Amino acid sequence: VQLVQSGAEVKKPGASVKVSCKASGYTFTTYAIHWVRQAPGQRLEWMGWIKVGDGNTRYSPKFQGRVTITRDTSASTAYMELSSLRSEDTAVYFCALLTVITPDDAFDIWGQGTMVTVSSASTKGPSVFPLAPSSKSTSGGTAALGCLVKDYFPEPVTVSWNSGALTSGVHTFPAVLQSSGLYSLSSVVTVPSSSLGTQTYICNVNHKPSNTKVDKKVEP
Amino acid sequence: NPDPNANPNVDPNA
Amino acid sequence: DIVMTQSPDSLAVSLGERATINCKSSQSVLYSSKNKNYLAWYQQKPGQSPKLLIYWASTRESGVPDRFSGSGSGTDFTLTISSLQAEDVAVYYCHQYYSSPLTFGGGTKVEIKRTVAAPSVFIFPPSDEQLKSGTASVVCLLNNFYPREAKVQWKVDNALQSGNSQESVTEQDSKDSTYSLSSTLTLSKADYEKHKVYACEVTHQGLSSPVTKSFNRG
């Protein structure tokens, strides 16, 4: 039982964005799909719902003129399109099967969220630099290593290690805002120092707004 | 009274 | 709209002690004839989607631990976490589904208090790729410490630096309740090459001495 959304986007003021929500694991027509947005640092705001069965919608008055929720029953997908975008619409947009409550059961499922940034500033992909392990980043039998992801706009970048197979000991830090208006962040992992000669560490960086994908090998 | 169409996924009993 | 207001906005509580989060609705969400309150509680962690804990003000979702309990009726609601665990660090949101639009509270951040833990300190010299591009970033890493207050100072040939670094802290760790911190000092390749000793200097309650990590350029 899953909801899976499309990836992050950058738009400029006055454009529109369309986010999709792929449902799987249940009969798509049984329940209503909702859209909830969360501006960064802000509370959750409900945008509206669609009954997937008949296609009827209800929108929150704050969005009533600017949002369209639709679905493709055959594709098992719901869509939310927000028009006449403003910088204020910068947020994470979620789709959700909010509070399905029956006499039998109660469940509630959310997509992973789609980040949308609305800005007139230029999109910029990151440079990825290795943070190599060395005698200055060992501590006993442990070594720290990482990747520096520098000078990108807007958020988010995602970082994984070894395609997601290395998660133990990973810290991916929140981005900082440089005086330039660009972001940078780092991602580190602690590992055995005894296996630096046999193990390969690759940080997988994706910046979907710039269509940038970097796989950087971190060597001693 | 509650609006049953506020969230269609909520059954008015549980 | 039914406006949902929480209090406090943020809370800091020791492992194993009681955390109380409040919610007030601007109008009653109670269906009196059914003694049914259209009130729910959600837990959210940074970068993750919300997770339903409680509905009808007091019923736990299946698989929610017993230490979470919701109560109240009408306009005032409380979520209580009785014996706080490390994985409970999160923002908690109330939610009404009595009338449209559906609305949520502003969130209450629940932080964990724990015992002092000193950081492990690591330093990273610039990469050759970056130096090739004309900039030098040095990264100082403070791993798994508590409390969050840590002071990093950069010294270049013993000269204390100001204005050329940025730092960031992780969310609180969901298993050991510690923080980590990354500090980046950035210079032009030209300035980097004018100096020899690059040092991160770390002050923290867990440490018996301002700890220095340093390297010599080359």
Amino acid at C31: Y
Size of chain C in residues? 218
**Domain endpoint, select from C49, C81, C113:** C113
Q: Which residues of A fall within a CB distance of 8 Å from B7?
A: 32, 34, 49, 98-99
Q: Which of A32, A103, A106 sits opposite B8 (nearest CB)?
A: A32
Is residue C78 a contact partner of residue C70, using CB atoms and an 8 Å limit?
yes
Is residue C94 a contact partner of residue C105, using CB atoms and an 8 Å limit?
yes
- Percent helix, strand, coil in chain C, to 5, is 10, 55, 40
Residue C103 in 3-state DSSP?
strand
Same structural domain, C13 and C108: yes
Q: Rounded to the nearest 5°, which phi and psi values hold at A169?
A: 80, 5
Enter the DSSP assignment of C187: E
Q: Which residue of B has its CA nearest to C31?
A: B1
Same structural domain, C129 and C55: no
Residue B5 in 3-state DSSP?
coil
Is residue C106 a contact partner of residue C150, using CB atoms and an 8 Å limit?
no
Instruction: Give the C-alpha distances (Å, rounded to integers) separating C197 from A211, C153, C190.
Output: 38, 14, 15
Residue-by-residue DSSP string for chain A: -EEEEPPPEEE-TT--EEEEEEEESS-GGGSEEEEEEE-TTS-EEEEEEEETTT--EEE-GGGTTTEEEEEETTTTEEEEEE-S--GGG-EEEEEEEEEEE-SS-EEEEE---EEEEE-SSPPBPPEEEEE---GGGEETTEEEEEEEEEEEBSS--EEEEGGGT--TTEEEPPPEE-TTS-EEEEEEEEEESTTTTT--EEEEEEEGGGTEEEEEEE--
B2 touches chain A (CB under 8 A): no
Q: Which residues of A fall within a CB distance of 8 Å from B5?
A: 58
Distance CA C43, CA C81 (A): 12
Q: Which residues of C fall within a CB distance of 8 Å from B12?
A: 34
Same structural domain, C150 and C69: no
Is residue C57 a contact partner of residue C71, using CB atoms and an 8 Å limit?
yes
Residue C6 in 3-state DSSP?
strand
Distance CA C183, CA A88 (A): 30
Q: Flag if C101 and A137 touch (Cβ within 8 Å).
A: no
Give the pairing type, strands A212-218 and C30-31: unpaired
Same structural domain, C165 and C128: yes
Q: Rounded to the nearest 5°, which phi and psi values hold at A105?
A: -150, 165
Distance CA A52, CA A28 (A): 7
Size of chain A in residues? 220
Same structural domain, C88 and C126: no
Work out the minimum CA distance from A146 to partner chain B, whole angstroms.
Answer: 45
Same structural domain, C77 and C38: yes
Q: Which residues from C are below 8 Å from B when comparing CB atoms?
A: 29, 31, 34, 38, 55-56, 59, 97-100, 102
Enter the DSSP assignment of C197: E
**Domain endpoint, select from C90, C113, C136:** C113
**How do the domains of chain A map onto residue ranges?**
2-118, 127-218
Q: Which of C209, C61, C59, C202 is nearest to C121 (CA)?
A: C202
Same structural domain, C146 and C205: yes
Is residue C56 a contact partner of residue C39, using CB atoms and an 8 Å limit?
yes
Cis omega (within 30 of 0) on the bond before A156?
A: yes
HEC per residue, A152-175 = EECCCCEEEEHHHCCCCCEEECCC
CATH class for the domain made up of A127-218: mainly beta
Q: Which residues of C fall within a CB distance of 8 Å from A178?
A: 166
Give the pairing type, strands C103-104 and C165-169: unpaired
- Identify the residue among B3, B5, B7, B9 best suited for mutation to test binding to A, counting A beta carbons within 10 A and taking the highest: B9
Distance CA A191, CA A169 (A): 7
Domains contained in chain C, number = 2
Q: Flag if A171 and C170 touch (Cβ within 8 Å).
A: yes
CATH classification of the domain holding C163: 2.60.40.10
Residue owning tokens 């208090």: C113
Same structural domain, C106 and C175: no
C125 touches chain A (CB under 8 A): yes
CATH of domain A2-118: 2.60.40.10
Domain region containing C76: 4-113
Q: Flag if C122 and A137 touch (Cβ within 8 Å).
A: yes
Same structural domain, C108 and C127: no
Distance CA C62, CA C54 (A): 9
Q: Flag if C31 and B14 touch (Cβ within 8 Å).
A: no
Residue C47 in 3-state DSSP?
coil
Q: Which of C67, C94, C97 is nearest to C78 (CA)?
A: C94
Q: Which of C193, C198, C194 is nearest to C212 (CA)?
A: C198
Q: How many Cβ pairs closer than 8 A exist between chain A and C?
A: 127
Is residue A67 a contact partner of residue A47, using CB atoms and an 8 Å limit?
yes
The tally of CA atoms less than 13 A away on the side-chain side of residue C156 is 17
